[PDB]
Design a protein around this nucleic acid. Structure first.
Ligand SMILES: Cn1c(Cn2ccc(C(F)(F)F)c(Oc3cc(Cl)cc(C#N)c3)c2=O)n[nH]c1=O
Lengths: 411, 526
DNA sequence: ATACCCCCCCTTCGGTGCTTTGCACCGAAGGGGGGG
């Protein structure tokens, strides 16, 4: 039949022992009828008390999906097995994928369930279903086959994936291919009627050889938003003081940003609300400052060795930002995620969709998910984020309790 | 009898226990000989180096090192059931199994790891006591016995905690008796010696602290300990008992009782008049016992929240008006500086997560706060916060925003500047306003942030109703901008009171020790 | 009797990370209730 690749951990550290958080009654009701079916088809099997490893589980509803799905939080397993994918097999990141006109994302994880998994590793991927009012203990199940959402599963399956997609790569060398987790990114420089034609052609092609998969985003049409200083004719002491302070803050990002004449301009303890003249020397200083700000930060470079860190600041009125970088004060990218559509309905949902957009863009551009620094309290985030989640990947996040009151990316 | 065992092992590195046994003791020989007949504890040869400690009471066999050396076991249980989450059931029965542990076999390979030498050596064919995974092993086996019955018919609702088997149904009495007898036989088929059907309980029950009636429930009656002199330990016991009682009795305050504990088991301390008065009030509340009710899925949960003052809230989850399902209080204070809205959202988060844990769904809240207030707060706070769903309820005290720090400068208000310093290797405060108004003053046990807060307090002290301020530190901005009410620092409380007294205040920030604007003078004197 | 585990509740430490030297913060412990 189909063989399996043994999986080994890194000796010296333990496996996943994450306590499984509670779930709504409907989530349990759907997960029962999903995991019973998965057990009937030999995909999963039960286990007894002797298994000391557990991972969470929750039933999301996919985008425009009449049914439910399932996700298992495999963050700790990846945290313990990063070296498996970092050494065994690594797919090169296409530099041209960032510059393609459009790409399409398909959920190709179904074939991940048709490949048997190792015997020794099979123990580690055990997940617990909760119970209503904890009347009965968790029915702890075990993945018999390769699991959807596990980082090391694509490493195993990429050989057969390549074998499948080699005809498509041959007949269509223009298309660029990138697989991340259970998702596949296909990149083309075609029109809507032709991009859709080729994506449906690829779907039919996968159907012809026993692989079934049940939106469009433009990598090239993403533009960084450069910071700018406010400009007007009548300036006050308060406004010029704010401008000098912002020039200070921004001197950290830009080495060449200086403020000395404006600092020397303000010497007396004057009222904030009075109108103050602005000399032509300050005009030239402001022009040079804006010229520096318009240009992207000189010397910006990327290192795959480090991890990607993304901060988010909420500017109100249904507007958020996101800054992705590795080394402090030299941002690799900045953005502006704005929507007033869901403002009247939700607030955390905005943060969830922002996080999804950031991680999708980072996967398209640099290829690895960012580590998020969310502006939200830990428990209120952990209570509700799953209710507004639709992506089969799970990014890593940590809540910085420090108040970032600067917020000079947008006054 | 036909119960397949479960593999047992240990943490890698070294074998089982090796401490010398003790045959002679307070007789204790014929007790274990009887189980050799039916094989619960069998005889083994003198080739067992895995010696174990021996104990017998009137057999809590000691495994003080075996539990330290046994492989880690995952927690089978994840809490304790609550009566409010039980649906209305007509017929109910309890079938607590006999000792739950001498009818479940132990793994064949593992028997060699434990021994009982009473001259000779006996091996355990059965689960011992003081064992790491014994509740988990029995619970899994006990589910493996149950599930064919539940699959046969799901009408019968079965709860199970530790060794206990709570059966409920909406059928007639005789049909329920027939079904429970069938369950008894089904359990017996796998070799469980349950107590006789005459010994099963009939309502009202007594559970883990909760007495259950055909249509109501409550906790077992409790009394409040009384003594002229209180040590700390009895105060902690009283606090714990009050917290336990706070699940069904509305409006229980245990905070300003708990502040007495801040001064510290056997050590004895005096009391406070507040403590005695509120203990009497709590005794008056607990004098008359109240009743809860049972869940009804054909309806919806509607919780309400009230504020009792100084960071304490009470909630009362129910379904039918003035018929509580559950009650509770939230009082914990994490961090330093919070207003009432932050604590209110913490309270609603805790209530909804508890409701998910218990009844598996969230309640449609009722909050005592205006819609526009929460709208402004969530559109103005820099963090992201949410509230599930809530309707306005008019009940004082009414939580609201105390003071609004202006986001724009105002005319007709003096512009103050503030600064201070200290010694890095005992600080001072000193500043110059737009007209030279200086109030330099030293202070002890202070640093840059303390003297900045002191300068802010001074500027508020020597200003009018409307005033604008320019600061050289972001720490004060972070403190005051959150609109705080209560704080550890009394200076912060005074500043908050000053801002409440005033009408409109606007702030700004400048870089420190840079000589920019008014920073030259304020960083010159101090 | 003196050892053994689960949710809840508090108070009091330590360590983190600068917000870098106090401070705000959070997690782990030490008692309390319920007991098993
Ligand atoms: C008294 N009573 C009731 C209440 N009630 C309703 C359902 C069940 C169920 F079938 F779920 F077990 C009950 O069994 C339990 C559950 C628990 Cl946590 C503890 C105890 C004890 N001691 C008994 C039950 O007590 N309904 N009708 C009536 O007379």
């Amino acid at each position: 039949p189909i063989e399996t690749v043994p999986v080994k951990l890194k000796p010296g550290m333990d496996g996943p022992k994450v306590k499984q958080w509670p779930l709504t009654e409907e989530k349990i009701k759907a997960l029962v009828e999903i995991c019973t079916e998965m057990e009937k088809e030999g995909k999963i099997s039960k286990i007894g008390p002797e298994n000391p490893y557990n991972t969470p589980v929750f039933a999301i509803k996919k985008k425009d999906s009449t049914k439910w799905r399932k996700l298992v939080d495999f963050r700790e397993l990846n945290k313990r097995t990063q070296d498996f994918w970092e050494v065994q097999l690594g797919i090169p990141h296409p530099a041209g994928l960032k510059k393609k006109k459009s790409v399409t994302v398909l959920d190709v994880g179904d074939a991940y369930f048709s490949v048997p998994l190792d015997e020794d590793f099979r123990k580690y991927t055990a997940f617990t279903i909760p119970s209503i009012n904890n009347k009965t203990p968790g029915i702890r199940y075990q993945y018999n086959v390769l699991p959807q959402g596990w980082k090391g599963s694509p490493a195993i399956f990429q050989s057969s994936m390549t074998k499948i997609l080699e005809p498509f790569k041959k007949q269509n060398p223009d298309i660029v291919i990138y697989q991340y987790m259970d998702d596949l990114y296909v990149g083309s420089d075609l029109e809507i009627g032709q991009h859709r034609t080729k994506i449906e052609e690829l779907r039919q092609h996968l159907l012809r050889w026993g692989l079934t998969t049940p939106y469009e985003l433009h990598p090239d049409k993403w533009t960084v938003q450069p910071i700018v200083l406010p400009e007007k004719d009548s300036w006050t002491v308060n406004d010029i003081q704010k401008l000098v302070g912002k020039l200070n803050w921004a001197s950290q990002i830009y080495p060449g940003i200086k403020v000395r004449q404006l600092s020397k301009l303000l010497r007396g303890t004057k009222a904030l609300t009075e109108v103050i003249p602005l000399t032509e020397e300050a005009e030239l200083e402001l022009a040079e400052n804006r010229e520096i700000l318009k240009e992207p930060v000189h010397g910006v470079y990327y290192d795959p060795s480090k991890d990607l860190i993304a901060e988010i600041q909420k500017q109100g009125q249904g507007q958020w930002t996101y800054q992705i970088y590795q080394e402090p004060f030299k941002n690799l990218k900045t953005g502006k995620y704005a929507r007033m559509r869901g403002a009247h309905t939700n607030d955390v949902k905005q943060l969830t969709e922002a996080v999804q957009k950031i991680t999708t863009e980072s996967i398209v551009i640099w290829g690895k998910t960012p580590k998020f620094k969310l502006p939200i309290q830990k428990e209120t985030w952990e209570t509700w984020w799953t209710e507004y989640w639709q992506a089969t990947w799970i990014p890593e996040w940590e809540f910085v309790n420090t108040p970032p009151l600067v917020k000079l990316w947008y006054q | 009898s036909p119960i397949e065992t479960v593999p047992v092992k240990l943490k890698p590195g070294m074998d089982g226990p090796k401490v010398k046994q003790w045959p002679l003791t307070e007789a204790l020989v014929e007790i274990c000989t009887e189980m050799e007949k039916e094989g619960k504890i069998s005889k083994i040869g003198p080739e067992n180096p895995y010696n174990t400690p021996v104990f017998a009471c009137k057999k809590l066999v000691d495994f003080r090192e075996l539990n330290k050396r046994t492989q880690d076991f995952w927690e089978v249980q994840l809490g304790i059931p609550h009566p409010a989450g039980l649906k209305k059931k007509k017929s109910v029965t309890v079938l607590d199994v006999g000792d739950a542990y001498f009818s479940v076999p132990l793994d064949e390979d593992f028997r060699k790891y434990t021994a009982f030498t009473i001259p000779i050596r006996y091996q355990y064919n059965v689960l011992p006591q003081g064992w790491k995974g014994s509740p988990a092993i029995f619970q899994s086996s006990m589910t493996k016995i149950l599930e064919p019955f539940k699959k046969q018919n799901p009408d019968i609702v079965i709860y199970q905690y530790i060794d206990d088997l709570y059966v409920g149904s909406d059928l007639e009495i005789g049909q329920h008796r027939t079904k429970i007898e069938e369950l008894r036989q089904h359990l017996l088929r796998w070799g469980l010696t349950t107590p006789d059907k005459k010994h099963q309980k009939e309502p009202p029950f007594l559970w883990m602290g909760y007495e259950l009636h055909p249509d109501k429930w409550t906790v077992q009656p409790i009394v409040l300990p009384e003594k002229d002199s209180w040590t700390v330990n009895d105060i902690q016991k009283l606090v714990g008992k009050l917290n336990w009682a706070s699940q069904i009795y509305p409006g229980i305050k245990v905070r300003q009782l708990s502040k007495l504990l801040r001064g510290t088991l056997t050590e004895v301390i005096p009391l406070t008049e507040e403590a005695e008065l509120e203990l009497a009030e709590n005794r008056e509340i607990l004098k008359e016992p109240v009743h809860g009710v049972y869940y009804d899925p054909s309806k919806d949960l509607i919780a309400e929240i009230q504020k009792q003052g100084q960071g304490q809230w009470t909630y009362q989850i129910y379904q039918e008006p003035f018929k509580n399902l559950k009650t509770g209080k939230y009082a914990r204070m994490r961090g330093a500086h919070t207003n009432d809205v932050k604590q209110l959202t913490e309270a609603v988060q805790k209530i909804t997560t508890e409701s998910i844990v218990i009844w598996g769904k969230t309640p449609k809240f009722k909050l005592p706060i205006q819609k526009e207030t929460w709208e402004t707060w969530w559109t103005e706070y820099w963090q992201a916060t949410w509230i599930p769903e809530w309707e306005f309820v008019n009940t004082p005290p009414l939580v609201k925003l105390w003071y609004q720090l202006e986001k724009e400068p105002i005319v007709g208000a003096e512009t103050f500047y503030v600064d201070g310093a200290a010694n890095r290797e005992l600080g001072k405060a000193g500043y110059v306003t737009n007209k030279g108004r200086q109030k330099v003053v030293p202070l002890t046990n202070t640093t840059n942030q303390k003297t900045e807060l002191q300068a802010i307090y001074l500027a508020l002290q020597d200003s009018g109703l409307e005033v604008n301020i320019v600061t050289n530190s972001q720490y004060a901005l972070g403190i005051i901008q959150a609109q705080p009410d209560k704080s550890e620092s009394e200076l912060v409380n005074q500043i908050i009171e000053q801002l409440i007294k005033k009408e409109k205040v606007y702030l700004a920030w400048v870089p420190a020790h840079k000589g920019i604007g008014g920073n030259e003078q304020v960083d010159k004197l101090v």
